[PDB]
Ligand binder design. Structure first.
Ligand code: HDD
Ligand code: HDD
Ligand code: HDD
Ligand SMILES: [Ca+2]
Ligand SMILES: [Ca+2]
Ligand SMILES: [Ca+2]
Ligand SMILES: [Ca+2]
Ligand SMILES: [Ca+2]
Ligand SMILES: [Ca+2]
Ligand SMILES: [Ca+2]
Lengths: 675, 675, 452
């Protein structure tokens, strides 16, 4: 509806060419009924040419992703810290579009690959489009934009055979990580549950770089952007993520689409850490360094407003595929910093859209257009959609009365560089020595996780590094891990049959910071949209009655309920053939269905039991409803007294207990820990 | 209208980026006042990226041209001969756009090169866009589309050095013409005054190919399209065209622009010759052969309606440069024929727009859009400007209720191939023997010109062939010319110092046809827009008074008057420095200015007399107004008794006589003839 | 030819497709002798598709031009002023390609329009391609690259009707000149005989900007490039130029082509004015200001070597139309200055080749290739002609033994920024007041012409 002016309705009418001539498109024109096709068949050629040219280049990174429309609402008048118009009044609303993504995979790769995730937000402001092009991880692998192709070549598939897809689990990636120690912090985040989020809705977004807020008086402060999820944080477990990559490559885009259509559109508090210019080097690291966080203990979050996604696209290609974000899409009241990663990005995003669009007029695509007037002397180029009336498109002119007028700090609400910014020194291709500590913050992050989270991170590294063929690369990796934590290096080395190097305690410490643990972020604040699989049977009418009564009680609380049975019928959503534990956040067996848990042509041997066992092993709340639990729980080897295992006769009591389980989300006592 | 919706007004406001952010664009952002430019200067890069990408590939042919908007009005309900909707009612109006062009020159080449000229007309009909992509000459050089690159490579500049621009006067072109005798008919037209028309408004347009008109009952007739100029026919002389190419490379586009702005928008009667399907081979040649005309004596013209151009474009690049014509843009009621030149064109024009536009969505540019709804399953591609609501874009479907519906002869006013068409025989790459007479019609054309026109054509061939370096090519040329006319070959040979081959009378005859002669087409039906230069002086108050009284009386009759003098002042439009005889259709000297016709720092020596003499030598009406007369005519060696030479004291009597001269347009008795 | 390995010979043999299948190309395949053309006629479609796509975008400026190959020969070992390898020995020869042009006209406009002219030279050095992208007039219209589209829009045809072609003789151009007084110096040069040279061979070339020569020890000097014509200087007269624009739009390209074929290949002494860094503001104007010349009386020319053009192209499109010059094509021993016109050009020329070539691999076109090995981790892109053996194209790596190695001042003959260059002050979009005298040098130029 924000792009309603560009919509084309095909719910009625006769087929036409692109120039409005009514045609057919089902049979080629031929010289006789069993004859050759004619070149004069323009109906054929226009249709096939279009098809032949449908594809455009995938994004060079973040190729796999999905988007939605929404609204940003300001919680206050923020004039006292920024001139930005979209933040200048309590309750002020601005349309947004957001795209979420992975980084490394090509555009049909699985959502649930282990990776960094993008979170890109466009504010269609009344003073121009403003984009925050962020990730779900607050720090980046590298300290200089010029290194980006080195990073990306190393993590993408090996270029002789293009193996492996959407994965860091190969020699080249771990070679790069071990030789470029800046990578350690982002690596630790990606090897945590932050690399396999439960959904786009259950992850945060970060600007990563320090930016500036600039007031109308010219004064500036340093900021970091934080989008805090109102759905809570949650992750998958790796073994789950692997199966889900096969059973549902579209899991995250489906989850987002469904949440929006059910009226559960996801929300984030859009926040900033704000510090003075004088604190650039006050926190024991450089705020120009994008491998570093500011701990919340040193600078608290200020909540600026609400981001809500509540409308799905009409056409994916036209909206999601074509949206072209840029950190260069900046508005008055915001400015850059001398972060050498940010500085280079400003070049890349303007240039890459030429590749994607094939032409320079990509800002004229509906999804990229602003919602205010455009007044400039840009002309021509392939795909030019405007018809410009001003026939004197040069400045300075008298023949168009000196219009358009120049905008700056003092006239026309122009963008302006923060006027206190300076530069001083030699022109150098040198790294600031203030960037040289690559290991303390990785250690801060590791220290801040729970014991089971630390085990999962260790396990993710053991998984990936065990697939590295080069013994030299594996040694080099242990050398770098060892500088973060001797314990990590020892535990990782045990899996790959190497000795860890001797402890090097230069960067070891015991500091912790709040807000980076997933397990530690307590029960989820809402269980709406979570998925409950009810395993039933058509062989017992009482099993379907149990299923229907459970459905009513669970749906009342906004859970998405799937009843599973051997075959479809009224009340049954899915067959055992298509069902999997990866499709549910909790699994309930109705006790009328106990007999399935001891063969059928309608689903693979042991499928009903496998769903239950997989769900248990992956830490999910599981239960049996009806009061006869022993047969199912014994077949599964699930103890009745287990945490997150439910056994009740009463449907009401069953659901009350089970819903607490869904909020807990994962029962971490079911995972073994290294001594 | 898609044009009005995309018009952009920059007559007020502050400069913005393409995403609506107010900016400046006059100074680069630098590290200090004498420092280097910063990469983070997004204002710089967006502006320069746009400039860097302004150009698109020129058209492969017809790159040099100009366009205007107007209206077509039907004179009648033509249902009795065609189903075409734009012809289905008396007074029915359809918007048009027309582009006129040369063929061989690049953008930037001179309008007044000797060449075939394009005349491409788009009708934005209520049943889709219909294009007639025609030339100002009714026959084409070649008989099969597959030869087009051979023709075009031969006429375009030699590919080692890219010489010469916009000219057939070089060895490769005449090699091709002499080896491919199909070229003779079009060659004769191009070597006549049809190769150097006075304006786009003073030339006719032709579809060239035989097409079909198809009725709603399925019956068909064969047609040729003829656009007959209501301004009359007129040419330049070669020596004038050469000078004009240097003095004003924009002469034809200026003439069109100016006529439209003064409310003298040019008009054509849109006509057809209509013959029965059974007459395809009845006239002594094949109607599938595009090297042949139907003589008016064999099939008279039917006037279908009025084409008027009356509005200039707003932005040349957006409208004229981007307009993308196709013979494949056809409507119900029209069909193709098996002309092997037409057949191949249908492929070329769909394909080449991919080159020009850089992507498949070229029909979405405003100038290319239709004026009725588009309903089809074409999707995606670079530059996709629509948001399609139908999410089941396939046929057959139930999930969008079977829409869009198929259109055909019986439903939806679908296009349909003429149902009487058949094909029979071997699949062959062979030329029909009915196409083999390459010489009789060239001779018919030559016979139909006046003696002086025949001399001009011989003179154009003497000029071009004299510049061919190869003696063998020159001999081969005489061989082919000789098959058309022994006299032509004798007269051409005299200039290049070869002997003509012996007469070969196989194709010789004395038949003539009406309507192909320019000299023969009688006085112009209107003199509005024609240019009168009045040569005066600032020395003499009486010269300027003579000039002003002449101006008033000439401007009354719609003539564009320029008073020329040594310097500008009130009443004087142009200096002798910038004035040339090529800028006028008639030249008047006022008596008071006699002294200039016997040196000055304000213009080149002899410029005033040169303008007068050049005008006389090129056949234009010339005179002296004031009744001294003898001194100026003696200085010029212009005889007072000469046809188109005027000498009067009375301004009223002078103008009455002079205006008849302008209608006569050219005085051909001033050109020498071969014995 | 220097480009002999890429040449295709068609002086014998049978017509083939682009994939070597022998074919014909004179008649379409039809359903009967008077029948419609068949879609299965691949001979037709491959031929016509190629034709349909022959054209590329003309250059945004300098679209009308012509080129030739030649040789540059150094007169000495210039190590005392520059590390540049092509200048490091007496008699050292380097292949060149040069393109000359007008500025404003489209690619079939007249050579003898009144205009500034381009003079672009590529040296295919043994340390990489070095381009000097110069003009025949030593000063430019504007003082900041960001103004270039304003200048060019004003001088190009009015955008409602695209009139007039290749001429400053219209309201918009003179509006710009009169409102932007920086333009006065170049305007006076264009309005002199330098706007209508007799030939490309009878004009000089200038780098325009101050550049730096950098020695292997890191010290730098400021230079201006001057290519002095050994044929002399000569102009047309305007009335002559106008007539010639119609009688022979190809006059300058024909003149060059003919001179080369007759064994009269044109020559230039390649010269520099060399001054110390301390003289940037010593001559009464700023050397960062591209609207200013250094009078020969203040800094004399040093002759570095001979440029001779002596071989015409084989294929105009492939060589002349496709050559893609960049001031960013720099070699060790040369460096930029903070001239805000030069600074912006560095961005433009890399970007615009994407428009012309339609793809990122434009340096692989034969005319653009270097004459020395390429070792880098650039990969893929449309039109990729190389087959790279190194399957670890990232730095730092161990799996390709740390190759390619980094090159810099101290290893691998790397390019390096002149190490004494600094910046200091506010980040500003402000013009230096040292650039404000727009009128004295125009007057110096006018004073220096003869009465006629
Ligand atoms: C020097 C190059 C470079 C560097 C250092 C980065 N990126 Fe980037 N990024 C690109 C070059 C790039 C790109 C090649 O320009 C992409 C590809 C597609 C596009 O429009 O831009 C891109 C895409 C891209 C997307 C996808 C936007 C969308 O959904 O369409 C996200 C979310 C980011 N990037 C985020 C980041 C973050 C958070 C970074 C570091 C803090 C980062 N990028 C550094
Ligand atoms: C098989 C190729 C071929 C053949 C045989 C022809 N043409 Fe064509 N023509 C082209 C291939 C083409 C082209 C390459 O497709 C052009 C260049 C730009 C475009 O839109 O199509 C074109 C452009 C073009 C234009 C310019 C349209 C404009 O103003 O934009 C006109 C007026 C014609 N042609 C007319 C003719 C006529 C009357 C022909 C024979 C009767 C003819 N052409 C044969
Ligand atoms: C910021 C933009 C800009 C600015 C300030 C300039 N130019 Fe430029 N120039 C271009 C943008 C450009 C371009 C758009 O990037 C072109 C078009 C084609 C190409 O390869 O580069 C170009 C082409 C071009 C050519 C044609 C090279 C060839 O023959 O292919 C010459 C000789 C010059 N320029 C010379 C200059 C000189 C002597 C300048 C000032 C001292 C100058 N340009 C400033
Ligand atoms: Ca690998
Ligand atoms: Ca976790
Ligand atoms: Ca392209
Ligand atoms: Ca030739
Ligand atoms: Ca049909
Ligand atoms: Ca103008
Ligand atoms: Ca002179």
């Amino acid at each position: 509806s924000p792009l309603a002016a560009y919509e084309v309705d095909d719910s009625t009418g006769y087929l036409t060419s692109d120039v409005g001539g009514p045609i057919q498109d089902q049979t080629s024109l031929k010289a006789g009924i069993r004859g050759p096709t004619l070149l004069e068949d323009f109906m054929f050629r226009q249709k096939i040419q279009h098809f032949d040219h449908e594809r455009v280049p995938e994004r060079a990174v973040h190729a796999r992703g999905a988007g939605a429309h929404g609204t940003f609402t300001s919680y206050a008048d923020w004039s006292n810290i920024t001139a930005a118009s979209f933040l200048n009044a309590t309750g002020k609303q601005t349309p947004v579009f957001v795209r979420f993504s992975t980084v490394a995979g090509s555009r049909g790769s699985a959502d649930t690959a282990r990776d960094v995730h993008g979170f890109a937000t466009r504010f269609y402001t009344d003073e121009g489009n403003f984009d925050i092009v962020g990730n779900n991880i607050p720090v980046f692998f590298i300290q200089d934009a010029i290194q980006f192709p080195d990073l990306i070549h190393s993590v993408k598939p090996r270029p002789d055979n293009e193996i492996p897809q959407a994965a860091t689990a190969h020699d080249s990636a771990w070679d790069f990580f071990s030789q470029q120690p800046s990578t350690m912090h982002t690596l630790f985040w990606a090897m945590s549950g932050h690399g396999i989020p439960r959904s786009y809705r259950h992850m945060d977004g970060f600007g990563v770089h320090t930016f500036r807020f600039v007031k109308d008086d010219g004064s500036s402060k340093l900021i970091k952007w934080w989008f805090k999820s109102r759905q809570g944080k949650a992750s998958l477990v790796w073994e789950e993520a692997q199966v889900l990559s096969g059973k549902n490559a579209d899991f995250h885009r489906q989850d987002l689409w469904d949440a929006i259509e059910s009226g559960n559109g996801p929300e984030w508090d859009v926040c900033v850490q704000i510090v003075d210019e004088s604190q650039a080097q006050a926190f024991g690291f450089d705020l120009l360094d994008p491998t570093k966080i500011i701990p919340e203990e040193y600078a608290p979050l200020t909540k600026l407003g609400l981001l809500k996604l509540d409308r799905n696209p009409t056409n994916y290609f036209a909206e999601t595929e074509q949206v072209m974000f840029q950190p260069g899409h900046i508005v008055r009241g915001i400015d850059f910093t001398e972060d050498p990663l940010l500085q280079g990005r400003l070049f890349s995003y303007l240039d890459t859209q030429l590749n994607r669009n094939g032409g320079p007029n990509f800002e004229q695509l509906p999804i990229n257009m602003p919602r205010v007037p455009i007044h400039n002397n840009n002309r021509d180029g392939a795909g030019q959609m405007f018809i410009h009336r001003n026939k004197y498109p040069y400045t300075p002119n008298t023949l168009n009365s000196g219009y358009p007028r120049q905008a700056n700090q003092n006239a026309g609400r122009g963008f302006f560089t923060a006027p206190g910014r300076t530069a001083s020194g030699a022109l150098v291709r040198e790294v600031s020595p203030t960037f040289n500590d690559h290991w303390s913050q990785p250690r801060l992050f590791f220290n801040s996780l729970t014991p089971v989270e630390q085990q999962f991170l260790v396990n993710a590294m053991r998984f990936e590094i065990s697939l590295v063929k080069s013994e030299e690369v594996k040694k080099n990796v242990l050398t770098q891990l060892n500088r973060v934590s001797h314990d990590v290096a020892v535990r990782v080395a045990a899996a790959i049959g190497l000795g860890a190097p001797d402890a090097d305690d230069t960067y070891y410490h015991n500091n912790k910071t709040a807000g980076v643990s997933i397990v530690g972020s307590g029960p989820l604040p809402t269980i709406k949209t979570l998925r409950v699989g009810i395993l039933a049977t058509t062989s017992e009418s009482s099993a379907l009655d149990q299923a229907a009564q459970l459905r009513t009680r669970l749906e009342k609380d906004g859970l998405v309920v799937t009843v599973v049975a051997e075959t479809l019928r009224e009340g049954v959503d899915q067959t055992y053939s298509t069902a999997d534990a990866t499709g549910f956040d909790g699994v309930v067996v109705v006790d009328g269905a106990a007999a399935l848990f001891a063969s059928s042509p309608l689903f693979p041997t042991g499928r009903p039991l496998q769903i239950f066992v997989d769900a248990y092993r992956w830490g999910k709340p599981v239960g049996v409803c009806g009061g006869k639990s022993s047969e199912v729980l014994d077949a599964a080897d699930v103890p009745e007294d287990g945490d997150g295992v439910y056994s009740e006769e009463s449907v009401d009591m069953f659901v009350e207990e089970f819903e607490k389980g869904l909020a807990t989300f994962r029962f971490t006592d079911r995972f073994a820990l290294d001594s």
